[PDB]
Symmetry: D2
Subunit: 385 residues, 4 copies
């Protein structure tokens, strides 16, 4: 048949005040506090948030002592949960702790599992446009509250971005922007719309440099359903590792299923994901392709990956195959868990910054896995100039 | 110039894995509530750690269910019936923090708005009878057989917690070509010699699945088999290993072969777009491959809170489109044929029934053991019709 | 010859805002709410409060459903904990619930072993010791003053204490010291409170009590004598059901069995026997058979018949009656089998939330069945008295 | 000539396995573990125990770190909760922790709180304890001895003992009337088997050990597991908290109580330190020939190191024509009841508390407790001009 429809692709983000991101953030704050004092701290800490209470749960091996309830109440306060009026208060909320405890170049993976990494040309950050934009809107929505550019806002928020795509699977036009924010009851829906349209949407669209993808009719949906007066843990339970697609590539890329936050870099779910980001970004910035995705997988006890899979979605260049690039990857990168930590210098308190507004393509941060410092070595292995 | 073999991996876990225990407890509560009150609103999270199950979230129902009894019964059925195994359902702790009894159905009205924003992906492939990718299909079969040989006593001394992993060598046109690596880690009784377990699992679990799945054609020659490749697995489940609902969404879907919107399925009633739309996309994709419009299809959908019609939809067929149709043409057919408003999905697929507990382990998709409404090939004729075909 | 030291006896009370009473009140709100819907409900509900969280634990058999989290949040709003400013808000607090256990009629045995004590004294019209009676009146008044606006800037958590000088006959003589620590808004000074509480709490209560003939001379008054009482309730201060048994009973003037009252349905002999034994003691003192009377009863699990009973009048017996003699009189007038006690006092009704602060006994402001002076005739008669 | 009835007075105790004494014991294991490393540790810890879970709660200020979960699981195993079989297992139960609050000197050490506390002593026994609570503690202690030493098999840790005594008209113990014991057991035995094993190896062994054969003549009504099957115990279906056994911890109802718990409180809490002191005061009043039975009440205001209350009562057992007021005068001169002085007088900054968490805090001949030393007799008499 002749009817065609336009393909729209969507990615979402959430603020630090979303109860899932609260948990990812408390988990990574506890990890950081421990690495500050004992860099070799073994840490797998789940946070759960429900009305009035934060549960801290999981396994720690450490020489340090850290005041977990103070870490929790303080992080809740930076986030902005500082009264019962806004629905949660760091100073007066519950904290419950249930923690217990159950290197070598060739020391094996602590678990089996699969981990994916992705990079693309479409943005300077090497990040797909939909999630990059969704993240920018969620960062900005927190910023205009914290710097007091828009008054009456509260920490809980979600953003969503839908883009029109050409037949070649390339971004073409910004179609639909959704922003839902928590706020005071003294503020309505019309006032919020002009505030966020001005100070968040129009602002990010300029700062991202995409004003040529945002001409004509754009559907803008601001708080399109219900009064977002209360939020965070009040009414809506949060857990660590329930925002893994927000954490990554916003659905543009595949995922091995493992969460990041609350895990020290010994956990291949976290460090191998970061490694695959590193490998992928270096594949693309070395001009071996426009888009690259790399899976790795491990067996518990074994140190050499049990698997590695390169895909460039027909963006391959210099008449190279994915099997050829992958050979180069094996030649350039060392993917034993203990080597990745050495290579990316991961034994440091840098994780709390990654718990909200993405672990990848972070221009506001300085992440070891975002370094494009293996491009030359890749080009050499493929006999390129 | 030199070349590497591309190797793809997917994993599964048994119902005894602490994350799957949470998913199963969450979907046992959902089922129990839908049996008494099909319009129940349920967003129920389970946490497990040493000695204790926490039940947490939002519930709006006219029914009463004994959560602690359901929790203990599920654990005893899973196999956690003793402190010797590391967790006993009869003696475990159960804490319940649930509210939202109205104090703070549109799912029936088809013009009713999504309950939240979000993205959802569905996928299908003619690689298997169940329209599923081989890696996850094999991993799920291995995890199901691991639990099966224990509950039926085909292999003695086994315990509930376990993990399975499958790696396949892939050709240059992204097709599976050979089984390369199989991993099976299982909780077990202390009096077991690895060699006896290695031989038992090789014969009763791996070899059995390779025949049941009909892939001996892909399992010739040298296959790497790792069984309990690390340490001793005597304690398992929540003992020294925290579990949470929604921490196995890739195992619950396509094993990394397809994309994902990030939402969990267990603990959520069909009014949750995160689950209903993902089941819908599985339906749309399976009906696109069953109608021979492609060999593989991936469909994404997205919604805005308070809005019935999706904000977006994305059909990919990975250059496998047939009948010389583009992906923009198959999508035109999809919109003509499928009602993707949430309320319409719930009705199209008759979702207000207690059928969710069985999905909480071994996958939501390609379940020939079950009869799930989103696995039905019942929209093929309508799709081919709107594509001026038959 | 050898010098004498005036004997000084103390009793203490607490507001509904004290974290331990928060727990007793919640436990008894859940009990009342189950009996409102089902009078045969079996209830053994413990409450724990700590920073931000109420835990409800224990065992129930009921045919009814009760919204525990709402009863809890509501009962914190009434107590006055309705903001993070005060250190606890019922609307945003945590609630976690771990409850389980999904002549035969009077030959029904008692659910447990145990000892329970009952006391009466003619010192007061409510037949309560002077010190715990005054104590209760002080903490009741401290709450009333905040909830009616008589004193502003007050917060719910508070403790009152009362020490009395006594004669050589174990009889009260004078009020030596009243102490009153209260929570308050940080916009207030101890000096302002000292005068406001002395006026509107201590002086009002000394009058309302009819105790001004014991009020003369120098009274030592300690008002917020330490630190600043700005936060209270569960903030920085763990609370548990069954942690205020002496405050709930006779303030140490009488003996105690050990059993908590709150969170227990009347089949729990810990409660129903102590209620019975208040009733007997009160009827002994109102019968003119002694000025002070204390009775101990003990049960064995499974046996309806008490295994022990022990009347004591501290040598204040009247009409030449021995304790043994009064004790045989009690057995004749009083069915002290669990099931009888329930029938006698009509306990299967929602009347316990009220008992959870300010005392279980001598409650003039209530209508408690165990406070009924209605076996006076049958006690006299059985003793050949007019 | 109206009819008489004999007066019957009762006391109870519970084993270390009773869910409430679990909490007290765990709370005092934490206190000890902290005093062991920091003697100035400020500890206000509550334990809660329900099916499968121990909640540890309250306030602590210490320079030390202790592995609370390790302390909990081990205490539960020592008690004998070491299996899902017996209804709770130390090795696999939950542990959740919710703690926080990281001119004369002894005059500025004012009381932590307001509160009344009570002390008691009596001639009736070698350990200066009333007869009922003394017998109940020995029965409950015996009831765990025979399990731990394999003297009576098929026993589990949960356990309750009650003791009723006939009283003569002068409020004095005449006859051992009724003994209750309810013990947790394996299914491999029944009420009848226990009936005879507990009689021979617990009850009869204790009557001889306590030397009350002359109270033990005639017809003793002995009720043993009188009701239900006691197969599962501890927290399995029965919530325990710290501070819900304060009368078993004291004198079994014979004496009065101020209503403060002991367990999980450091000696800076007067609820604990004053009560211990008051036992010490009363046990010296009685051993100094000054009386047969002595009860003393002390009371504090928060901020004030000087008691706001003192009350000596000897129940007309006072000797040498001395009034209660005169005995009180000497008590004041010989005893410093300021909180800091009590801690120093009895050396309370030591890990000695887990042993008081069961079987009584007073009259404890199996232990060596500061507040049990009769070492103020000579001084008290001197104050009354005696020899
Ligand atoms: C803090 S201690 C190390 C202190 C040092 N060994 C000492 O004696 O003071 C380490 C272990 O205690 C447990 N733990 C519990 N709460 C902790 C906390 N707040 N910080 C660190 N470790 C904690 C973890 O299992 C961890 O391995
Ligand atoms: C028990 S249900 C319906 C009760 C019914 N309206 C009645 O007659 O009592 C009411 C609410 O209780 C809450 N709830 C708490 N525990 C529950 C449980 N075990 N089963 C069902 N609802 C429960 C949910 O918020 C639910 O919407
Ligand atoms: C809810 S009651 C009666 C249920 C009612 N017959 C029904 O099925 O619709 C059943 C049991 O639930 C337990 N329970 C748990 N939470 C409860 C609550 N909030 N109110 C009442 N019972 C509750 C009690 O142990 C009680 O025996
Ligand atoms: C861990 S202690 C002393 C630690 C020492 N100052 C350091 O930096 O390593 C500090 C506070 O931690 C809290 N705490 C929480 N859990 C504790 C535990 N298991 N042992 C000791 N203190 C604990 C108490 O409030 C205590 O005063
Ligand atoms: N009224 C609302 N409008 C839009 N999003 C909301 C609203 N209330 C809550 N949310 C967000 O969506 C999630 C699910 O309700 C919440 O955790 C919060 O982040
Ligand atoms: N010794 C072990 N070998 C392999 N897998 C294990 C072992 N112990 C636990 N596991 C599994 O891996 C997860 C993380 O260690 C556990 O939840 C469990 O499923
Ligand atoms: N600053 C204070 N002064 C006196 N009593 C207080 C103070 N703060 C709390 N309290 C009371 O005493 C207990 C704390 O020791 C609390 O339960 C509370 O009721
Ligand atoms: N079957 C029983 N017989 C007697 N006492 C029991 C029995 N089961 C439990 N107990 C004790 O009585 C308490 C409450 O019933 C429990 O905490 C336990 O110590
Ligand atoms: K939720
Ligand atoms: K874990
Ligand atoms: K306290
Ligand atoms: K109980
Ligand atoms: Mg979530
Ligand atoms: Mg993982
Ligand atoms: Mg997990
Ligand atoms: Mg969602
Ligand atoms: Mg208290
Ligand atoms: Mg009791
Ligand atoms: Mg108890
Ligand atoms: Mg106290």
């Amino acid at each position: 048949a002749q009817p065609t429809a336009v393909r729209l692709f969507t990615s979402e983000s959430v603020t630090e005040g979303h109860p899932d991101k609260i948990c990812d953030a408390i988990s990574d704050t506890i990890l950081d506090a421990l690495l500050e004092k004992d860099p070799q701290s073994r840490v797998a800490v789940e946070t759960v948030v429900t009305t009035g209470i934060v549960h801290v749960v999981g396994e720690v091996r450490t020489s340090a002592y850290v005041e977990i309830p103070q870490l929790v109440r303080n992080k809740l306060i930076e986030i902005g949960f500082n009264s019962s009026e806004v629905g949660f208060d760091g100073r007066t909320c519950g904290v419950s702790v249930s923690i217990g405890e159950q290197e070598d170049d060739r020391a094996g993976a602590g678990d089996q599992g699969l981990m994916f990494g992705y990079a693309t040309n479409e943005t300077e950050e090497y990040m797909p446009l939909p999630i990059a934009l969704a993240h920018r809107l969620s960062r900005r929505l927190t910023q205009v509250r914290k710097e007091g550019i828009v008054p009456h806002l509260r920490p809980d928020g979600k953003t969503q971005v839908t883009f029109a795509y050409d037949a070649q699977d390339r971004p073409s036009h910004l179609d639909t922007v959704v922003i839902s924010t928590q706020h005071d009851p003294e503020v309505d829906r019309a006032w919020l719309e002009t505030q966020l349209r001005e100070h968040v949407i129009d602002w990010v669209i300029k700062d991202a440099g995409i004003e040529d993808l945002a001409t004509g009719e754009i559907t803008v949906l601001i708080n399109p359903s219900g009064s977002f007066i209360l939020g965070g843990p009040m009414g809506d339970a949060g857990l660590t590792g329930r925002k893994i697609i927000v954490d990554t590539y916003g659905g543009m890329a595949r995922h091995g299923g493992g969460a990041f936050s609350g895990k020290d870099p010994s956990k291949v779910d976290r460090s191998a994901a970061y490694a695959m980001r590193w490998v992928a970004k270096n594949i693309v910035a070395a001009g071996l392709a426009d888009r690259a995705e790399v899976q790795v997988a491990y067996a518990i006890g074994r140190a050499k990956p049990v698997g590695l899979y390169v895909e460039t979605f027909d963006t391959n260049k210099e008449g190279l195959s994915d099997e050829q690039i992958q050979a180069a990857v094996l030649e350039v990168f060392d993917l034993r868990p203990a080597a990745i930590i050495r290579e990316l210098d991961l034994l440091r308190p840098i994780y709390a910054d990654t718990a909200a507004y993405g672990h990848f393509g972070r221009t506001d941060l300085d992440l070891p896995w975002e370094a494009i410092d293996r491009v030359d070595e890749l080009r050499a292995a493929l006999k390129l100039a």
